Structures are given as C-alpha cells and as structure tokens.
A = this chain, B = another copy of it.
C-alpha cells in the first residue's frame, strides 16, 4: 500500500471521473444497450468529444 491520505474507493473522494471519453455497452455481443436510436450517438455513450 505505502500510501496514507484519502482513499477514494472507501472514502468517496473521486477526482479522475472527468478522464472518461466514451463508453459502449453491448449485450450478447450483438445488441448495443442504448439502442432504439435513444441517444444522439445511438451506438454508444459519448462523454467528452474533442473534435
């Protein structure tokens, strides 16, 4: 371990959650979760878009 200070996992002090670009969820390796054209990008959840 060799680390004092805040432990986010059992302390609730999260800070790296802004470093997520996108996430894709697939069921049965065939069907995307946010299907049915629900989202603006219907294939997967975008979090940050830089272009």
Main secondary structure of the interface of A (DSSP, over half): loop
Q: How far is the CA of A43 from the CA of B39 in the complex (A)?
A: 12
Q: Is A19 an interface residue (CB 8 A)?
A: no
Q: Is A37 an interface residue (CB 8 A)?
A: yes
Q: Copy number of this protein in the oligomer?
A: 2
Which residues of A (22-51) have their CB < 8 Å from a CB of B?
32, 35-37, 42-43
Can you sample 9 A-B contacts with CB below 8 Å?
Answer: A32-B37, A35-B37, A36-B36, A36-B37, A37-B37, A37-B42, A37-B43, A42-B42, A42-B43
Known pairs A32-B37, A35-B37, A36-B36. 6 more at Cβ < 8 A?
A36-B37, A37-B37, A37-B42, A37-B43, A42-B42, A42-B43
